[PDB]
Design a protein around this ligand. Structure first.
Ligand SMILES: [Zn+2]
Ligand SMILES: [Zn+2]
Lengths: 148, 108, 85, 76, 94, 82, 99, 99, 83, 109, 93
DNA sequence: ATCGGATGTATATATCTGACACGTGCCTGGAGACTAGGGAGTAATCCCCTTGGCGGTTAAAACGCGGGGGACAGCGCGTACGTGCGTTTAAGCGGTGCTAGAGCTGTCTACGACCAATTGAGCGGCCTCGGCACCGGGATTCTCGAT
DNA sequence: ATCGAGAATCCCGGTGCCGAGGCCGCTCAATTGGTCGTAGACAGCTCTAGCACCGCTTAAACGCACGTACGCGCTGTCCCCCGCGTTTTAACCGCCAAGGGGATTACTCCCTAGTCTCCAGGCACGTGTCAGATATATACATCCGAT
């Protein structure tokens, strides 16, 4: 109903001023479902990595947060293998004023560095905090083989 | 909502849902406890606590202090009407009373 | 001085305000958005994130949420937008 | 030695592993050939949990044995 | 060592930080808050138990807590508490 | 053994309590009445407090017993536990 | 020659000062001794935690403040300013404390 | 020639008669209509059992009798025989019903 | 089939009789309005709780037990109607 | 006792022991109920009801009536001190009011 | 049909024990039943709260004794305690 | 200080009627026997918090005096309220009709209790620094006797 | 109406201290997984009484006239709390020391929930008769005007 108009204005704003290093598009003709493409920041061990994620808008927007999942797989402390994302702004304090471009920027920022406070998997967070190199080499072996 | 995470986060609350569930189960209130009661009770408790704390902080700011003291709690409780009606029988230790002088006693 | 048009629009629904409410944070948005925020959101103002539970509770008893002087200028300045709603 | 593992999604995987390989080694191999993270993998043989520190041969597991994989989904 | 004593200190601190980001709280006010929380919990739970026993049932569902909140609280606090309880239960279910 | 300790509640204490209450002029025959009502209230509370601290097979009066005795009388108190 | 305040303007100052404070007003040791006397009348060889007498004193002070507020209201209703024991007895009766 | 009592005597006789009696004082049908009117505000088209209306009216009578006793005590305290609304207000405020 | 201004049903002789039972010899002229106001307030307070008790049980007819329970919770226990 | 008669007769009580025990167990009060609690509770209840019935019967016989009516119950409860204090905040249906008139309202000499 | 429990014949037995000839109407019986039920509820609630207050899990005779001592005024409390102690002593043997 | 109406209340006697005391069938809940397991009683131990004591110092309580403001008694009035009577109004009692809705029975499906393993949220202990308490100085504002 | 001097109160700045907000280690209970007995959600039937209507009383309500007593305002008297100053007393802080018992752990044992079977205590139902509510006719308590 009224949600689709807001989505139309938001996609028009997205198209007129596309953010750098993030892309988004309609996965299907139906309005709610969307696809997006993310590639890792330069100051990160995820260089040369392209990743696809699918987002499903709820029945009413933006009063409830939009569901987001990764059809591709990422080795990150704050994301499960299945693709679930633990993001504080996404679920705990989602607000109607925010736009999904800010959500994608937050996803990129979390891709830059994880959050110690709410680890998705305690073991990988323990690995990350214990030292640097033992996450470095798994990340290095992981990036190219899955992205390409 | 999606499962496989702590219950206090699924409902978006801060009070512990599991602790409230345990208290309800072991409190000799009923033989069986539903799965939606602890969340509702935790939400109500959080709402009341936030409602009191906001007014207490406003009183503390008005008193040029940056710390909550029992006098600020008493001011916040008594100044409001609904909370005064609810907490009409309790007595806050070291709270004092509101300033109130009858108009007849004032000098003429 | 002037209500204008771009500044007049509601920050949430991108539409014309209907019975505007002025939050204590001096945030103005249309009544449908505020209402939907009450029963489908976190009860706080989305922009600067300050709880307004006490103000709303105090005002709803006396029914003073609506801004009469703002609604009057909205009617007199954009009757065509208001009549559609 | 070929062994059979069954997951919760109805997928059966054949592992070409020797008894000398430890639980960490077999977890790394199954992660390499299937992608499932070793930590999220819980191994069930004859209805018992398998410990990472001890070797596979400590379970007296022979050719064409049946294993069950348990996925511990955390977060969401 | 001493046996553990459960308390609501960290939760009240988190709520206070959520409301006022730069305001502390003393220990006596913390005790007042704990007593208030315990009192409200006892009131709501007892009213719900009595109201569920009145109907020859054996379960305290969400409806019993909703009706207990409706009875105990004043006119506007009851409405707001019911609204936020519906918040929490709807967000938890789906 | 203590005898005639109710006189410890002297006139200035009653006057200060009255001033906090909000009175301007206090008669001279009210102090005995205030002492009597205070003694009655203290006896009533301490009876229940002692009954609580005696049921538990103890010999000391903890703050919990007093808070419970006040709560039993519709005089709930906040600050000392609960 | 000395500056003497008119009778009446000191009571209002005391009211303004005491209604703004939060300290306890009754003495500590006399109240503790009175409580101990009542207790030893009820039961012999008892010991008191400090928080126990603190709570007892807080409750007594709050109760007496409420009683004096009601007494002042009754006295003002009687077209007077002074408070008298009849006002206290009537307040207690109407509150249901004596009946 | 006509004979009439001094004011204040038949009032005392009415008091003596009514304090001994036990029957309900307020008429049935007006009270039932008032109860229905008040109830329909909260929810539409309710139906009322007779026993519920009787119990409500009995509680009404008891509460009003108690309030009038307290009001009379206040009026006699104020050195008057007549009761007035200020007496009712004082009696309610001391009891804490209105606060 | 709505009803209006039935608060006038509580008649002046009825209030006089109640006061006489209470032990009042002389009655002013402004007592009746305050008595009616207090009556309406008390009745509203009891009826709201009784209606809520009925509403919880998914019923449509308030019962004597509902009124007794509402009065008992409100602070005024009542005997003789079952409890 | 003989451990062969009914519990009420074994304890010498007219009030029941089985019903009180069932109500204590199924009343959501505790996870366990002692073997002597129902007897004590039934004894207390019987004593109080006997006291009230005695006072009400005495008041009724004083009024030249052979039946106990709620007015007699109200008179018995209000006249006694301890019963009035225990039942201060209870209302008796069709109970009436104790007859009293303030001394000021009485006519002058 | 359905069965409803009440303390009718028990109160009648007590009345005949204390007054051989005097009768009782129906409304007085209802009032007595309501009073008995209310006192039972009060004492049971106090006993349960006292049991919870000491981390116990049972309700033996002493909790009921303490609840009786709390709830009833002096002389009635003493008489009720004496009667209960006598009843328990007679029942245990 | 009583006397004579004059009213209302109290007392003696017939009567007939609806409710209270009681007989009766039966069935659901109370009673009796056995068991196992966890809650509660009992003994030994630790150290925490209670109690008792003494010296200083000083803020507070006690006592006394002058007097001004309020408690209280008495007078006068005029108006609102009590008392009685003729008149209009609707509550009360009876009888009938009907159906909305309370109450119970029969199915069965989904929600909730139970047990193990496990690991992370939450509690006990340490700690350091900033917010609040305290003192000294000045500026500001009620207050009252005399104009 | 006011001016000004004595007094109480508020602002501001500097110094010091102790408790509170954060960090670290650790023990226990919340979570996840599955299984299983049953509670109530729902459909259908019954059949009770709550609502609506009508008609006939006569009991209660109502408006009006008249008298009167008391609520209220005013004046006067006196006496008793109050404000202040001086003296006596014990509260309060700090310190030290002894020990009573509150809290804890380990062990054992016996009280009771649970299960199954058997039977009678009390409940729904029907019935007899008398306690008392009502009506009628005397006898005395009490009030009011006037001696
Ligand atoms: Zn909008
Ligand atoms: Zn805002």
């Amino acid at each position: 109903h009224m949600a689709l108009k807001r989505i139309n204005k938001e996609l028009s704003d997205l198209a007129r001023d596309p953010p750098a290093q993030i892309s988004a598009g309609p996965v299907g003709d139906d309005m709610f479902h969307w696809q997006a493409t993310i590639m890792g920041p330069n100051d990160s061990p995820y260089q040369g990595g392209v990743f696809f994620l699918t987002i499903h808008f709820p029945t009413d927007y933006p009063f409830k947060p939009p569901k987001v999942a990764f059809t591709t797989r990422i080795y990150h402390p704050n994301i499960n293998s299945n693709g679930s994302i633990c993001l504080d702004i996404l679920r705990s304090q989602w607000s109607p004023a925010l736009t999904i471009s800010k959500v994608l920027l937050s996803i990129a920022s979390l891709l830059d560095d994880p959050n110690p406070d709410d680890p998705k998997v305690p073991e990988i967070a323990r690995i990350y905090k214990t030292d640097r190199d033992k996450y470095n080499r798994i990340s290095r072996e992981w990036t190219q083989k899955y992205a390409m | 909502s999606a499962k496989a995470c702590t219950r206090s986060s699924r409902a978006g609350l801060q009070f512990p849902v599991g602790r409230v569930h345990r208290l309800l189960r072991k409190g000799n209130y009923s033989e069986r406890v539903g799965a939606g009661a602890p969340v509702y009770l935790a939400a109500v408790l959080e709402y009341l606590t936030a409602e009191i704390l906001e007014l207490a902080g406003n009183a503390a700011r008005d008193n040029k202090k940056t710390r909550i003291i029992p006098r600020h709690l008493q001011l916040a409780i008594r100044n409001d009407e609904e909370l005064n009606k609810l907490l009409g029988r309790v007595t806050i230790a070291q709270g004092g009373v509101l300033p109130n002088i009858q108009a007849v006693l004032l000098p003429k | 001085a002037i209500p204008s048009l771009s500044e007049c629009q509601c920050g949430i629904c991108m539409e014309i305000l209907v019975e505007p409410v002025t939050l204590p944070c001096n945030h103005t948005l249309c009544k449908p958005c505020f209402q939907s925020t009450v029963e489908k959101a976190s009860l706080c103002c989305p922009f600067c994130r300050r709880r307004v539970s006490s103000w709303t509770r105090y005002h709803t008893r006396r029914n003073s949420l609506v801004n009469v002087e703002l609604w009057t200028i909205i009617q007199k300045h954009y009757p065509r937008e208001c009549k559609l709603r | 030695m070929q062994i059979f593992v069954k997951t919760l999604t109805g997928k059966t995987i054949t592992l070409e592993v020797e008894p000398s390989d430890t639980i960490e080694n077999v977890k790394a191999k199954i992660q390499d050939k299937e992608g499932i993270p070793p930590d999220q993998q819980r191994l069930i043989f004859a209805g018992k949990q398998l410990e990472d520190g001890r070797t596979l041969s400590d379970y007296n597991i022979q050719k064409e044995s049946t294993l069950h994989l348990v996925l511990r989904l955390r977060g969401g | 060592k001493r046996s553990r004593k459960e308390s609501y200190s960290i939760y009240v601190y988190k709520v206070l930080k959520q409301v006022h980001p730069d305001t502390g709280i003393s220990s006596k006010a913390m005790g007042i808050m704990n007593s208030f929380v315990n009192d409200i919990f006892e009131r709501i739970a007892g009213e719900a138990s009595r109201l569920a026993h009145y109907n020859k049932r054996s379960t305290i569902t969400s409806r019993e807590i909703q009706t207990a909140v409706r009875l105990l609280l004043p006119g506007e606090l009851a409405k707001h508490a019911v609204s936020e309880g519906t918040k929490a239960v709807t967000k938890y279910t789906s | 053994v203590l005898r005639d300790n109710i006189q410890g509640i002297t006139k200035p204490a009653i006057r200060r309590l009255a001033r906090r209450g909000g009175v301007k002029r206090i008669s001279g025959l009210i102090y005995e009445e205030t002492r009597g009502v205070l003694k009655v209230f203290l006896e009533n509370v301490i009876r229940d407090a002692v009954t609580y601290t005696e049921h538990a097979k103890r010999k000391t009066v903890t703050a919990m017993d007093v808070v419970y005795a006040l709560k039993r009388q519709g005089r709930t108190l906040y600050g000392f536990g609960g | 020659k000395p500056h003497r305040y008119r009778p009446g303007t000191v009571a209002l100052r005391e009211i303004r000062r005491y209604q703004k404070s939060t300290e306890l007003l009754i003495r500590k040791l006399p109240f503790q001794r009175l409580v101990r006397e009542i207790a030893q009348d009820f039961k012999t060889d008892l010991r008191f935690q400090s928080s126990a007498v603190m709570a007892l004193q807080e409750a007594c002070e709050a109760y007496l403040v409420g009683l004096f507020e009601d007494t002042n209201l009754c006295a003002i209703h009687a077209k007077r300013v002074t408070i008298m024991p009849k006002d206290i007895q009537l307040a207690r009766r109407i509150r249901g404390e004596r009946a």
